[PDB]
Design a binder for these strands. Sequence first.
RNA 1: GCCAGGAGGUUGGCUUAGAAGCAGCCAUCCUUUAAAGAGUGCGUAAUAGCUCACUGGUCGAGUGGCGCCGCGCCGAAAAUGA
Lengths: 549, 51, 83, 140, 37
Amino acid sequence: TGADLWLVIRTMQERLGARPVVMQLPIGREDTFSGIIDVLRMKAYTYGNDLGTDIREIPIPEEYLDQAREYHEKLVEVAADFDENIMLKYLEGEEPTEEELVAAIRKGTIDLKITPVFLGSALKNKGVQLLLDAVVDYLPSPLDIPPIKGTTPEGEVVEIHPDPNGPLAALAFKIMADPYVGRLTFIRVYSGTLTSGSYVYNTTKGRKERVARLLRMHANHREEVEELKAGDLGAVVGLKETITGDTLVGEDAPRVILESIEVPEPVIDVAIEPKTKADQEKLSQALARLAEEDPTFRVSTHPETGQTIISGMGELHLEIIVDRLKREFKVDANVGKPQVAYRETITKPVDVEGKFIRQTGGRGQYGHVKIKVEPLPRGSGFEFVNAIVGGVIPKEYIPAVQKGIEEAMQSGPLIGFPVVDIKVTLYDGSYHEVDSSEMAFKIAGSMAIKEAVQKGDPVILEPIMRVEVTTPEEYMGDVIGDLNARRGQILGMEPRGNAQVIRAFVPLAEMFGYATDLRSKTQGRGSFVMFFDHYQEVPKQVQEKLIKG
Amino acid sequence: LEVIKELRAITGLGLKEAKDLAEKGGPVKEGVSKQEAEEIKKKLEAVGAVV
Amino acid sequence: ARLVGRALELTVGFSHPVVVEPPEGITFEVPEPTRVRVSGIDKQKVGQVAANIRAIRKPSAYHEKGIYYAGEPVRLKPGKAGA
Amino acid sequence: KKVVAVVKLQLPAGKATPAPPVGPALGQHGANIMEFVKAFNAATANMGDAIVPVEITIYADRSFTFVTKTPPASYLIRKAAGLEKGAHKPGREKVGRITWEQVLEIAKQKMPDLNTTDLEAAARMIAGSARSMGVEVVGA
Amino acid sequence: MKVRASVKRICDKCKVIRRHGRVYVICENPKHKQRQG
RNA sequence: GCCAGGAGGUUGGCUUAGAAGCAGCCAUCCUUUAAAGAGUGCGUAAUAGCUCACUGGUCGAGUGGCGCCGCGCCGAAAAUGA
């Protein structure tokens, strides 16, 4: 209900912006379809009956024929801007028959500059033979296809000629779990040849690799082949290692290389915690079948505490692979919202008093610490000073005790979470040569610090971030809306590549995952990137339900 | 040389009516816009409208 | 919206066709099935029955679809709001 | 074939980014705002740059003709009062030095703008704005 | 915010009327709908 | 109720990623005048923009606000049937 021509040929250059050019005409509107009167060979084809076994070409009953003229005449005009016959031939007025016609249009078609909208229908078997034939008439093969960028075993370029004779240059791509035989990969050769009785050589992670069987998955059945043409494609039975998109050479081939870098970066990130982790390993080897056959996602273990992070592009992406979960693997889990990479701090410096001057009688090991401290603005770094008041505790009594600070740092006093953006500054202390020691002063440090954090004004910061939202403008308004409505402040205004891109301070804990949103507003045009700046406090009170313990 | 450069409407759209050549135009001035004077009427061309 | 027979036959989002038969004090008219006119004589039956047409279908809501005598659509954000 | 699309804007010498409204009004004009920041820097070589409204005209086909105006008063008072940029709370704090004195020159060299089409009237508009911009217009 | 013993106007679309009984509060945005209950 | 401007320094200062009368804080000048407010609400990411105060007309006889004394109105939902 909404048959067209018009609105379509509009919604080409009002979505991207490119000269289309059409090559036929739909007889009537919705459910008022017969066939197509082509403005190419200039004829009204149709079926009458829906199918295509009692078709016809039945005389165009005037109606739109005349109209077609204007439409059809467009044809000629276009070929006056690419050809070398049809400038002067649009000038002349002569009839351009399918001699240079098909050549001009094929030229433009493989030139990436033409959109000969053929259509038809479907259940309404319209456009079957129409686009079968149109596809032969203008949709090309490896003749016009340019050398698919690949690289050399030293670092230079070459051409991936069809060349059925020479250099055995190869690529595969599609790792597929087939039942009848097994791991099958779908492949495009590129150069040389290959027999269903040969080896090759994996030219990423080496293996001369027996090619067992060459074949083609074909309609209702399957056609097997004993050889495969250079430029043609196929499927291969064999190959146990190999990856999705790894450089390939043959036996005869001298260990060359391939390119096609590609980027399947992750955007939506949600973390996992199963039943009692009794299935974690099953799902890890699952990720061997997964982050490899379709390397899409990342299995980046928690760069901090206990909870593996599993990141990926899209969202339902993650969902379909979490559906692969409770079927083949049949494992139960809890894909929680990620915790919080955590580091505390303070705002006030204090003259704290730390101790460890303890013995008994006949074994020294003292540890006194009259320390002073001071922090630092959020996201600047961490250093310190000496504060020697004459060299009171020299030699071995410097780095280990400082490590006392560190070993009081790996477990921040409130809930055992780190501290950064600081700048210490001790000043006084005591000891005794044979009656003090290394680790003694280490725990001097640890202790001193522990009170120098617990009784010194507590506060934690939450992992702040930066981001580039690549987007149009309608939803520049929308996105900035919910962007500020995610607790933080943007900061970033520049008219980028195609449209406009907003730079944004965001908080992660309240900025987590925007792709699902990004598409919700912007339909699906241009996303965002996870930068890291540092961390800021959570409005002094949000952390009250969070100090739950 | 004028239709594939100045005239936006390609080479067969502005001169759609090249069936009987019916098109004139092209502005000009004195001092500044002497780019459209004789460098579009000096390069072996011929539009005798004003300057 | 059709002037078939003498009266209203129209679909406005619904599947089942909406039929409306004219009472006395009015005559019917449908030019192009995307705009309709009645020609009658009673300011009571004018607005009562015409707002009964605006009751044949509720207007706009978020964007714009339905019946307006000549009214107007006000937008209420669709790509978010409800979350 | 644009029938008159003469379009002005707000651009100082040296800031060439032909984005809207340069795009939908002068982009469909093919005017050189690149040549703007270049040659406009020439006719205005007093400090190289200054905020001045451009204006490019298209003529039935594609003829070009750009026109210009004047800088903002919040610069005429600034780099002549000792008020480096701002002052905060323009009434309580009297920092600068434009008294009843140099205001004669400042108001002088700007004529084809303001509002009063003369110089003996809105010079009090001048005398007040200096306060609005946090400067002492002390008596003399 | 329908129904409450006090009822007031914020913008000039907001107004008060009598009909079939008690007080009624209206506005252009009918989000400002009340009653005296 | 209508046509019409509803301006300019000014995007006031300032902060601010930007803050244009309009998020906000500090905040009073005058000008082409019949008339425009360092601007009333709306609006934009912030401009742009609807705006109203101002003012002239069109036009024809009243009009809008405040303080007061009475009566009614709501605020008002229970367990047998009134």
